Amino acid sequence: MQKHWWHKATVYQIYPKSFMDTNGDGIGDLKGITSKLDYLQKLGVMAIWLSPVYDSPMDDNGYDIANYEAIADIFGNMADMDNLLTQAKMRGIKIIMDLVVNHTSDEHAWFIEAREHPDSSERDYYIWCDQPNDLESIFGGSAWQYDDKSDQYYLHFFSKKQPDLNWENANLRQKIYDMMNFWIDKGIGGFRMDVIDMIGKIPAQHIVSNGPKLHAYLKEMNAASFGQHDLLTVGQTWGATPEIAKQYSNPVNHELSMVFQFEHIGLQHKPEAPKWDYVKELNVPALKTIFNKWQTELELGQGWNSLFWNNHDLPRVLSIWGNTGKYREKSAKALAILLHLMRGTPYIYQGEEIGMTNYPFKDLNELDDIESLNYAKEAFTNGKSMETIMDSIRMIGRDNARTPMQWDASQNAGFSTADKTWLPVNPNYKDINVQAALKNSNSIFYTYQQLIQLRKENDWLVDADFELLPTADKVFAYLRKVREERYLIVVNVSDQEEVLEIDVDKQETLISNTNESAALANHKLQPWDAFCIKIL
Numbered sequence: 375m376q377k378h379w380w381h382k383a384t385v386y387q388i389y390p391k392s393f394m395d396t397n398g399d400g401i402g403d404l405k406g407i408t409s410k411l412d413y414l415q416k417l418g419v420m421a422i423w424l425s426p427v428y429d430s431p432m433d434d435n436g437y438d439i440a441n442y443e444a445i446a447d448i449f450g451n452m453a454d455m456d457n458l459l460t461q462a463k464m465r466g467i468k469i470i471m472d473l474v475v476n477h478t479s480d481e482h483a484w485f486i487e488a489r490e491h492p493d494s495s496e497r498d499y500y501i502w503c504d505q506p507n508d509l510e511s512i513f514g515g516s517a518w519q520y521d522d523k524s525d526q527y528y529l530h531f532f533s534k535k536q537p538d539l540n541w542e543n544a545n546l547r548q549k550i551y552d553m554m555n556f557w558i559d560k561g562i563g564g565f566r567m568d569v570i571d572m573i574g575k576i577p578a579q580h581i582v583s584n585g586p587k588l589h590a591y592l593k594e595m596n597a598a599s600f601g602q603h604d605l606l607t608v609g610q611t612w613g614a615t616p617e618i619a620k621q622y623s624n625p626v627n628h629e630l631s632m633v634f635q636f637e638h639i640g641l642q643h644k645p646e647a648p649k650w651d652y653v654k655e656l657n658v659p660a661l662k663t664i665f666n667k668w669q670t671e672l673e674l675g676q677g678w679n680s681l682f683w684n685n686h687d688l689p690r691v692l693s694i695w696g697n698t699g700k701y702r703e704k705s706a707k708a709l710a711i712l713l714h715l716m717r718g719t720p721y722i723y724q725g726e727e728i729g730m731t732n733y734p735f736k737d738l739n740e741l742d743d744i745e746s747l748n749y750a751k752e753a754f755t756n757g758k759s760m761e762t763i764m765d766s767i768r769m770i771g772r773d774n775a776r777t778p779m780q781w782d783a784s785q786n787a788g789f790s791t792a793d794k795t796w797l798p799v800n801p802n803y804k805d806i807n808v809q810a811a812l813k814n815s816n817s818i819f820y821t822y823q824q825l826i827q828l829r830k831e832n833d834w835l836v837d838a839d840f841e842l843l844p845t846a847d848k849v850f851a852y853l854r855k856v857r858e859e860r861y862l863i864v865v866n867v868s869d870q871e872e873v874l875e876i877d878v879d880k881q882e883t884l885i886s887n888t889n890e891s892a893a894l895a896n897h898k899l900q901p902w903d904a905f906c907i908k909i910l
């Protein structure tokens with residue numbers, strides 16, 4: 375297999391509104407982001423996933439884009455963007471632009487010209503209809519919004535202020551590619567293609583994900599954009615099996631670098647139930663099955679897979695699958711080690727490296743996410759009490775991932791110098807902040823640092839195969855094997871003392887959050903024990 379720069383990279387995702395504020399309005403800035411590039415470089419990340427900073431009414435907080443080639447003035451101007459690119463480049467860090475091309479804002483020029491002047495060419499950039507079907511919006515209600523000015527329903531799989539783009543229109547596609555080339559020529563490191571599995575939509579036939587012309591569109595995109603350059607393109611794929619992932623990310627097909635898939639995330643809720651009917655107790659054997667499926671059936675050279683616990687749309691991994699009290703940091707290290715020592719590109723969400731958690735939202739007002747608000751308003755008149763709803767949201771609501779980045783124990787955790795922040799800062803910033811994590815030599819942060827370094831310096835993380843070992847239910851253990859080399863990874867995914875019935879000859883320790891000698895000797899693991907050792 376022929377390697378690329380991103381085959382040894384670890385990606386750090388920054389949520390701009392909640393990273394660092396430097397003008398005291400309670401919202402994060404581009405300058406705030408640039409001011410922490412030394413911290414990110416110290417962490418050892420190679421690429422930064424930058425959540426949308428484009429012009430937006432912020433209906434879906436940046437994912438309703440009104441202009442792809444302008445910076446929202448709440449984040450600064452284009453000069454700030456270019457400066458961020460430059461300063462990150464100087465520190466060996468590439469910027470990966472988050473991109474939404476399935477739909478735009480309704481305040482985007484294309485749509486404005488489209489519902490005005492229905493004789494425009496922009497009219498066909500969007501999906502217009504006379505006789506709507508039963509397609510529902512992911513954020514609730516119908517997917518068709520009746521515009522009474524033009525007497526036509528337009529398609530929106532998300533909010534009504536997020537009309538879908540018509541990807542059967544090659545001219546629209548062309549303009550998209552024009553924008554992409556615009557950002558590419560600004561010297562970015564790649565793209566995160568959000569929801570990109572939806573561009574092959576045929577709404578008339580009730581087709582959303584995995585369309586028939588999907589990979590043709592992705593091939594066209596590649597050939598017209600990043601296909602010539604050397605960029606990391608990660609696509610978010612909802613309908614994703616290992617074979618589909620192959621179709622997406624096999625280097626021969628000339629489409630994407632890798633996929634971003636949520637099958638293991640699906641274990642956060644009951645089978646085929648809405649994500650609001652959550653499950654705290656993680657089914658670790660199920661996670662073993664899924665992880666093994668994606669580690670084995672996605673062979674080297676035939677595709678590449680992403681490694682992630684959480685992002686801006688998910689609950690922080692500690693609140694859903696980890697520990698938030700006694701073994702908080704230990705559980706965080708355990709999960710980190712567990713995920714990062716598999717094959718693929720690991721993704722770290724901001725604050726995960728210090729082990730941040732979900733926020734204790736008590737009432738509906740202090741929320742912001744349109745998805746949570748819609749779910750709440752529906753469920754309230756659908757037999758659910760406000761307390762049940764608030765519990766469900768406290769567990770699963772996306773706002774839990776969008777609370778300000780906790781840096782220190784200053785005002786607003788050193789995120790902002792304003793009276794209030796756009797979202798509340800979690801009180802645990804008393805204990806959970808970047809300064810304190812940096813001070814402690816053996817903190818979660820340095821575990822992530824060590825993992826990222828091991829990924830940078832050692833080829834086996836890319837080269838070694840994967841073999842699942844038969845352990846206890848809540849014990850996740852595997853082998854990375856390549857040539858003479860054999861690496862054992864052992865992680866106790868439990869709050870309780872578990873069993874380890876194995877004998878190995880330990881040659882050296884690569885990483886450990888506990889006494890691995892004790893665990894190997896007494897054949898039993900303490901809660902959240904995790905290590906990686908080289909064995910003979």
Ligand SMILES: *[C@@H]1O[C@H](CO)[C@@H](O)[C@H](O)[C@H]1O
Pocket residue numbers: 434437438474532568569686687
């Ligand atoms: C993908 O796009 C959706 C819709 O704009 C947004 O809500 C998510 O946050 C993003 O990941």
Ligand SMILES: [Ca+2]
Pocket residue numbers: 395396397398399400401402403448
């Ligand atoms: Ca600001």
Ligand SMILES: [Ca+2]
Pocket residue numbers: 522523524525
């Ligand atoms: Ca009318």
Ligand SMILES: [Ca+2]
Pocket residue numbers: 398791792793
């Ligand atoms: Ca102030």
